[PDB]
Symmetry: C3
Subunit: 601 residues, 3 copies
Amino acid sequence: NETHYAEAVIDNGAFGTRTIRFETGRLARQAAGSAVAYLDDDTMVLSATTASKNPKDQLDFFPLTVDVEERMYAAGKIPGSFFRREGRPSEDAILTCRLIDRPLRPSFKKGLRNEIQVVATIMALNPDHLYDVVAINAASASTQLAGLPFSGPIGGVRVALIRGQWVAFPTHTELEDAVFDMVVAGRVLEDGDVAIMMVEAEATEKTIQLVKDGAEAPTEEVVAAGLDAAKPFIKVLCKAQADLAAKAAKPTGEFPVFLDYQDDVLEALSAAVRPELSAALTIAGKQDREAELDRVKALAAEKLLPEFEGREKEISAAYRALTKSLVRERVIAEKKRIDGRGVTDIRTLAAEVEAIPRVHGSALFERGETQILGVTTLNMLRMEQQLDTLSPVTRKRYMHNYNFPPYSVGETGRVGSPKRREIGHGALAERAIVPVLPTREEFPYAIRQVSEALGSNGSTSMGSVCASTMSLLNAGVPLKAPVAGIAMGLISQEINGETHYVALTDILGAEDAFGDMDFKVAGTKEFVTALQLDTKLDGIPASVLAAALKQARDARLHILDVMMEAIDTPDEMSPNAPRIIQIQEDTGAEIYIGAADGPAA
Amino acid sequence: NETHYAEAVIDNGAFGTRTIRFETGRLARQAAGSAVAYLDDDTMVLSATTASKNPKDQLDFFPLTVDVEERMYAAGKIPGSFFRREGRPSEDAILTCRLIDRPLRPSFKKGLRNEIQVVATIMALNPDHLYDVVAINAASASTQLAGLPFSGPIGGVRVALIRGQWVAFPTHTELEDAVFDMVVAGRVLEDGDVAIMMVEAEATEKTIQLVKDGAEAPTEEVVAAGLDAAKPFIKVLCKAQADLAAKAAKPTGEFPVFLDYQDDVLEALSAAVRPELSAALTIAGKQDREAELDRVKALAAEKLLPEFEGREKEISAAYRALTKSLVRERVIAEKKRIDGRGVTDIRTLAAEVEAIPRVHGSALFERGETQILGVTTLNMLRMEQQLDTLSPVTRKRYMHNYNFPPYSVGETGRVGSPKRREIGHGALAERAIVPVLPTREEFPYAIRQVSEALGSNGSTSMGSVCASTMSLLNAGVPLKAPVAGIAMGLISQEINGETHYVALTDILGAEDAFGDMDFKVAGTKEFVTALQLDTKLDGIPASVLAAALKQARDARLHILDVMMEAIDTPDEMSPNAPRIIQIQEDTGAEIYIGAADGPAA
Amino acid sequence: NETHYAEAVIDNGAFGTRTIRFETGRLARQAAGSAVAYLDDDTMVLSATTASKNPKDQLDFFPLTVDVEERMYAAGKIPGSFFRREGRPSEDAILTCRLIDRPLRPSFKKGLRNEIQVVATIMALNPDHLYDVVAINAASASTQLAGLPFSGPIGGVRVALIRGQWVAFPTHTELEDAVFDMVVAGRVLEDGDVAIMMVEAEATEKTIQLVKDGAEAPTEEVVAAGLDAAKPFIKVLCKAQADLAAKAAKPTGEFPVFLDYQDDVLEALSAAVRPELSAALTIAGKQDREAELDRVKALAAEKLLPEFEGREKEISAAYRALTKSLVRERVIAEKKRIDGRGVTDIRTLAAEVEAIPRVHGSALFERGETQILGVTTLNMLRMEQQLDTLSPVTRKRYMHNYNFPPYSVGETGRVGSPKRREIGHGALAERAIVPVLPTREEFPYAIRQVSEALGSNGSTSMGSVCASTMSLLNAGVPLKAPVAGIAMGLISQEINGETHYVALTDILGAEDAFGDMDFKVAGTKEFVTALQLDTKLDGIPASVLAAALKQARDARLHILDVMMEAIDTPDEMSPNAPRIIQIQEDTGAEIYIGAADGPAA
């Protein structure tokens, strides 16, 4: 029972040096794995990882749960809620859960069935520090120490482009000069290279002003440079964790790994319907191709029966594994996708404003089956949201809500509190717009943007950005520039010794599961305002990444054109919207005073 | 992929013409069925209906779920809640769900087992419009278009008696002159006649004053007239939907329908215990008759076994179907009910005030096994409820809460948030009292009425009205007149070519499932303050409806007599209640000022 | 259908006489059992007990649920919440549920499997009365009348040491002079003696001042005297209930009782592994002894198989029953515990302050596997909690929150709203500290204490007290005296005619299930500040109880020594903490005014 430590020195040159220190051995010793991460021995995050005694094979996927507990005492304050106790998690907590879950989930060895839970508690917080990227490393560390079969350690860092430099673990003070804020997580390969696994980035509310005053705008080139600048830090963080795990020398428990299907079933099924299935997947029409598929499912379920009694869960798994191979295979060879499109083809677009009566502003955006309705509401600043969390942010002038109803994909389901996904997609589309919003003084209004995903099948979040841009303009909000988004995919196949890469524009929901990389990009004509990436690939050639981003950029620019035909400049503010510039009875206006339906002079 | 429209022109003569316009084809195309309904192209409600891929036969009933999503942006305002996002549904939303569910649920072909969900979103709302009846039609339309086996279309309308005229889809401005507000939903029969399926009506806070100044009080006769005035509008709405569905020409999916039991089992069981069961149902005593029943259940479960192995779910279903027939049969032939009562007999009554110590006012009402405790609390107006929804109502001086605990019917269960039923019954009993309350100026108090259903078995909601009247009077609230309620039932059987009708006074819970029509009526000695009806019957003779309402009226008047013996005029306001008419320390009163335990001069 | 009554006269001599009156027959007649309890015909609590029709044998334990419904109308006020309706239960309600559940659950005949629910509603409350102990008796009464197999009636009373006298059912007015407040519940044995089953006691905020002015401090001796003074009242309450049940003469339903295992399996298993298991339990090392156990589980599961097919649930139950006997047996004979300790040995201790950076105050307390992190936060009084319940308490200057995460015991689980246990343990540790806190005027700060149970296995609540004392001192809070706690156990075995008693110091979680009595004690060096007890024993010798409490006292004093080495006197208040003693902009301080980071002169 001894305490072990390890440090990751982060050198930012003229901006100073900081340290992420890891600890294990004194806190939460009953958990399978436990670790603490400090940022300059000031901010502190405790992470505990536990696993169920027995595997939960009654499931088809890996059950991982991430929870982030924000403790108000970390900021030296008593919770302001009526119950004086912190309750339902803040937006930051939920977003941090996802930042942790995204790279962690895939890291676990395929087949694992034990239920895994990770709980990160923010116990001490220097008001000038950002805890999210500290929690990522703590979550990785505790999991590494739990003796769980996963490709750890995972290093998480934030790099922001401040005065031409990519500063690691920037502080709020430093972020005042950032043109781009980017969170990156990766692992170290056996050859020593760093493999990037997750990216969550955005431009800032300072970007346009900084660029105007001299800073370099964040384009695809700059963003890619930021990714390279992140690797050295990630390596240091992973090394520090590996050192911690080596010192702790915890035991590697016995965790069973299950197969989706034994080889016999895959060989049987293939031999039974490989040519038919291959032919069926050539049918572009969705409902027309789904006909054949439901049929070949019989021709197969017939031949392999009753030879395989009670091996259904295996024939299905194999049936998907097979479909996946054939489809990927066809994209590389024939260069055609499952819906008939070519690698750079965007589904049918459609844009229009004034989609809903009475509301301050609205827009309808369509891209294939993905349909997003955006609605804008403008009220006086006294309606802006008030926040009391472990964040310096206390008010929010621009609010975005993303709704994803079950009927969006033709099914039934709970209609209530927003899920973690809604929070995530909502946040990304929110961050994509923030950089082009007018200032509080230029436009004295609390702004609430709502995106209703009425139809879904391919990045509703990116579609949510486009609908937001138009809806806001339709409402009369003077945006500094319009913003559009697109969701890409990438296929990496090694065809006889050599590796082939293919970037797919505007991927369908299914193309996500078939691919090796998933990235989303939003921005104006000049630069990137939001970027999201996820992959397991050991890495891809600089030229491939550049080409994929350039392709994505081309798609974004086309979409901005379609959008501009619907609306170019802000519209005349709706009459229903208030006009902002005793007496509140005489003038009929509530006092910066306005509260006038429009008249009031 | 084209957009289709259809219109229902509502002609209100001197009050103007308005239009409910239906649309389908551009919004939410992934749902089984989708439709939009506009009221004067201003107020807008989107409705989407979805169904589960596979039936859910593991259930005994039809699983339908209705959700009403109120979007604050429809009123051009940012949600006022701390989270600036709309959350748990308002009372109006829940009540609208029920207005939709009541006529829709029965409309589905018996046997359907797929899970069905309907989601209506209020997207645009003219502050002078009422969205509930617009949502009803939208819900019907989307469902009709989903290709689901149901007796659509269902037309929903509101008719209010304004200046001698029944105005369809009245506005808040017009409702200022209404003596009766009535929501009605129905369908069009093959012969072209309209069959009314649901009614939700009430008198208003203006009724007594209007009648005093000349208007005609809403009696059984007037109410029946209102129902007739509703039919023409319902027909126009159904026609508009049928026209929409015809234009859309969506496909009629393959939805399986299941039988509760095959005929063999019903014929077997009947032949096995028909005479015994028939005899057992003649025993008036509940616990004494339930003895025989549990026995004949054996004599039968014996003979039909093991001849029917694994056919239990069928023997039970058949056993109920059989009981139902025998019981109905006996009511018509012998004119006697399952508990020994005659068609017009009211169960044993009991009324008393001062049932609970200390509280401002209380009353205990008993009618058979139904027992309701009512408790009144009086506070200063600053305690009245504040509301921020899609309704013009911002404050509520009179609040009614209805609690239905599991032990109310001898069972265990969740004790927490109020269910949709509690909201519904609570609302109906609330609306029944509102018309006789003193004005804000006559009685400057926030009033909270709570009804505890301590015993249940036959309209606790109607019993809730009676307890409210007495409790309020016991507290010293000067009601303009006392209110009482009664729950009726109706049996319609075609005995050899001709159809027989029998109205049942104060029905038991079981008599609800045995009947063909269920209606509840509340009111003073002079008129109706609340009415609720549900049926599937193609329609009943004018004279039958009139007779049923007259019977119900007789019952209501008898109950008012029993109530008046307990309390006639308001009592002396309790000393514990406050008296309303720096200095708040000197006078000991908080300032219209009172805040005095009674003294303060 | 008649109403029955019975009274329990409580004679407090010079302090007056009060009465608890029971009633049954008029309210909630559909519940299996129903009863009302009045305190001086003023305060009123209705209790209804219901049971599921069919037993729920798919469970291993008895499913009992207690709910306490606080009705604001009982105090003559409209709920202050936004929804003007009472919602999620107050702390008092949850604590009252536990006061009821603790003695009631064990009272049910072993083997019962029907789901039982008890709902107590507070309908009328004299502001000077405490309803908790009234609800206890009402819950007992309704359950007794339900004809359920349980050792009723259970009498609940509160005795407070006021001016040298133990006053029964004290009022808030009288509690102003109490040095000790103690809730006790018990039953009457056939010989007429009272058997105490549950105790929940605490010193008060008045204790130290009263003692200084002459009153006798509450030591082990005084506390024991209070227990004796409680028995006469308990007897009167039980007699009153028995009289009520006799008058009601309700029927005793047919409730099946199930066996955990038939005798054959226990005799088989014993003969198969009794000597091995007995040997295995001699291994002190946890992981080393769990090796043998998992093995003998085979040697047994082997011999008894396949002789016992489908009798697993029985072999397991028997395996525990056997382990329990052997372990208890060894403690009495050899005087050694399952972890190798002796009856008076305390596990390894460890204490330290300044455990977390930045926070106002913190401390880490360890006792065996039980590890508690305590964190203190100090804010201005405007941050104190505001309360609006059926209690005279409207503000809370000292707040304690107890968190028990799943990883605390190495497992996964829900991380959200606090469970009833957290509320209970949180409350007990809160009450243990309240008596030594500085006054509002001496220390003008709102204080929030949080205990994180990072490791658990033996009274985290008592460990929570110790961490609170140190954490508060570390923050600079001038406590009048330090407080420590310890959890005891007691084993009662009749070895050949005579009964042997053995008190165990600092019991492990398992030692709780093996014992016959569980008690926790906290306090300073001078007296007891909190006491908690639970047992089913018919009673224990005065000398045994005294000896157990003296042993517990010795343990508490040792722990206070270890704590004092870590911190003795309060520390210098943290700089991050605020200092309390237009202009709020000039002085930078918010106005008793302070709001200064420290400077402000």
